[PDB]
Design a binder for this molecule. Structure first.
Ligand SMILES: O=c1ccn([C@H]2C[C@H](O)[C@@H](COP(=O)(O)O)O2)c(=O)[nH]1
Ligand SMILES: O=C([O-])[C@H](O)C=C([O-])O
Length: 247
């Protein structure tokens, strides 16, 4: 399969597009104010092959957390990375300290608490909050989902955040939804208490094909997505530059 893309941004360098993953790195210093969202407009456009979505994620050893972005197959706008400052003062990413990754995966879609996809073809299904929560500034809050989602053979249910909460300072730490049930953690990086009532959509349910979860560290895998216990392994695709995709 081919991923077709276009990229144009003088503040970012394309490091490589190899073994199914594109990596960009920052050429300029990136300033992060405390308590506020930082967005990086990537100048990057892409369309996945049939049956696949795309995954967007950032990686750094500085004290900065990035949203893990689930990219729908019908999306034809510009991709953005959303970052949050872990400290209570300015943090900077000096040239080359931020890596930005994009790669594809096969997924499946079933037919409260679980809602149908927003648009034809969307990868994720919104999951509703089972109780009111109060999220205080610079604090983490955890919630349990225990009632099983729909079973889909050869796929693995996983939870990821949505981009609109992320823009408000609320990140979800992505995690597998395992047989026992899943503890979903939300951190508020903003300066204000955020109230999320019962029935609010707070995260999304994604069914990755099981090939996309591994324990081996590979050319084809990375600990940066779901963390260390289950590595994300992206599809073996080829990137192909189609400059007219750029808007
Ligand atoms: O980190 C992200 C996450 C999402 N999106 C784009 C592609 C998605 O299809 C669309 C909506 O994503 P959600 O609101 O559903 O997370 O925005 C990004 O550009 N960057
Ligand atoms: O909001 C989205 O999920 C995305 O924007 C969907 C399409 O198809 O364009």
């Amino acid at each position: 399969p081919h991923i077709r893309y276009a990229f144009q941004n003088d503040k970012l360098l394309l490091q490589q597009a190899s073994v199914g993953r594109l990596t960009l790195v920052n050429k300029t210093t990136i300033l992060l104010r405390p308590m506020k969202t930082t967005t990086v407009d990537l100048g990057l456009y892409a369309r996945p092959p049939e049956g696949h979505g795309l995954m967007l994620w950032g990686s750094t050893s500085r004290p900065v957390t990035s949203h893990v972005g689930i990219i729908d197959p019908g999306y034809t706008g510009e991709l953005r990375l959303i970052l949050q400052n872990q400290r209570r003062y300015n943090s900077t990413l000096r040239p080359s300290e931020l890596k930005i990754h994009l790669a594809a995966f096969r997924y499946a879609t079933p037919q409260g608490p679980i809602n149908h996809p927003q648009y034809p073809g969307d990868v994720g299904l919104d999951v509703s909050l089972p109780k009111d929560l109060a999220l205080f500034p610079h604090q983490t809050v955890s919630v349990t989902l225990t009632v099983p989602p729909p079973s889909i053979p050869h796929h693995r249910p996983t939870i990821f955040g949505r981009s609109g909460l992320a823009m408000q300072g609320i990140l979800v730490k992505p995690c597998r939804w395992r047989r026992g049930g899943v503890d979903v953690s939300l951190t508020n990086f903003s300066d204000q208490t955020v109230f999320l009532n019962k029935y609010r959509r707070f995260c999304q349910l994604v069914y990755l094909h099981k090939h996309h979860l591994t324990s081996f560290y590979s050319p084809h895998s990375d600990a940066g997505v779901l963390g260390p216990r289950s590595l994300f392994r992206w599809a073996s695709c080829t990137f192909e530059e189609v400059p007219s995709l750029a808007m």
